[PDB]
Amino acid sequence: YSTEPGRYRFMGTEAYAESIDRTVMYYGLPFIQEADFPFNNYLSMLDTVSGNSVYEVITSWMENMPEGKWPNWMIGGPDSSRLTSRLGNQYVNVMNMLLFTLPGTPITYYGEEIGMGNIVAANLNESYDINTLRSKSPMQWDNSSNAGFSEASNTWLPTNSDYHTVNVDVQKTQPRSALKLYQDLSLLHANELLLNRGWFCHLRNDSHYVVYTRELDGIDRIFIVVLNFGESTLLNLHNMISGLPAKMRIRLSTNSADKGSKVDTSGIFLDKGEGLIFEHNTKNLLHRQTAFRDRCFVSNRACYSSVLNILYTSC
């Protein structure tokens, strides 16, 4: 049923309590087609966050994957505790950014954009797993009755008690809500070739922060993503990356009040659970340098010509 153009049929597999080497086997072989990609839920298995753990997860998945394949990422699901209860509220925004800058297809569980939390366990007449009912609460739309989910007297599950201040309706007006940041990140990912395509180059591991870059050949622009997963600290980008101006302009940040502001390259101050995306104009792409050919990956390599405004393969 996948012969008609524009109607390709996707199919993926789910294997969770397994190792990475046995999981990447579902990608198939260069001459045998098995699956588009197996679903990746290693991020959703984290109960605490630090630079080292996220670095290990990302590096393991990106190294064990066959070359030229399409990765994917998840941060939650119907069988895992919701993110704001697993890791805390402060990490709600930054993780979303992490979802929208890594290469591959991101997958979002319903209610993650708003930032729902788990509900206290309750028993039902129907047979259900009480250890997983905490992540199946109804969607919160507005501050009306059963959060606007239903107009009936009783719902099949109780609604979270914080819906009076956490729902879709109220967040569409607040300019600092998580929904606005999610929409901005989605739009940026959809309207930039550097994010939906191009190289992904990661620097050395660190206990506090994770820093990586996205770039493409012939664009003369790079995105530098910096995330702080530890405590409030200070960072000097000059040591990690050479050839940067003294001042840089933030393209996007978790704290929406700092959008468009200027920061000093040596002395960036980061709070607990902060994220910055810098847009830099240069010509020294990392993946062409000799020190970083072992830490950059692509799928469907291409090069962009601005004079002709096209894409070509031979580079």
Binding site: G6, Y8, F10, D36, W70, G77, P78, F100, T105, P106, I107, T108, Y109, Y110, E113, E126, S127, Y128, D129, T132, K136, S137, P138, M139, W141, F149, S150, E151, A152, N154, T155, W156, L157, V168, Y182, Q183, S186, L187, H189, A190, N196, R197, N300, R301, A302, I310, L311, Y312, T313, S314
Partner: protein, 149 residues
């Protein structure tokens, strides 16, 4: 070569090379330019990367059918409620909608115990509702994937 010059005076300067060779040179230059344009077109059509697929460019949205939206005052979410909220999904710049199991079942947890693989559970609606939802999703440029046990 005066204004309105007739045929007889035309055979007076065309014989000169300065008026004999440039015409042929221009003709062959034009045909060469045509061939160059053809070669450039056929070169650009080749050497060009294959474009990304629909499942490679956009994020996916995972929905639990029983806890999204109720539309008949019964306490359980259904497909009609999902259809009624497609504008919100579109506003999120989502490309694919992922719906978990909704078949006619006797056990709805601990994986799933399916009673019929070609029916929709009554608490979620009917097959007509599913077809309407699929049509609505396809109209808005979205795509739908479902779970399989």
């Amino acid at each position: 070569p005066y204004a309105g010059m007739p045929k007889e005076v035309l055979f007076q300067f065309s014989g000169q090379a300065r008026y004999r060779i440039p015409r042929e040179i221009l003709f062959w230059l034009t045909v060469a330019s045509v061939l160059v344009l053809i070669a450039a077109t056929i070169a650009i059509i080749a050497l060009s990367p294959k474009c990304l697929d629909w499942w490679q460019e956009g994020p996916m949205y995972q929905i639990y059918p029983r806890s999204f939206k109720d539309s008949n005052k019964d306490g359980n979410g259904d497909l009609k409620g999902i259809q009624d909220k497609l504008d919100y999904i579109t506003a999120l710049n989502i490309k694919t909608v992922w719906i978990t199991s909704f078949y006619k079942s006797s056990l709805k947890d601990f994986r799933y115990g399916v009673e019929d693989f070609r029916e929709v559970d009554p608490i979620f609606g009917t097959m007509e509702d599913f077809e309407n939802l699929v049509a609505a999703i396809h109209d808005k440029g979205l795509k739908l994937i479902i779970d399989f046990i």
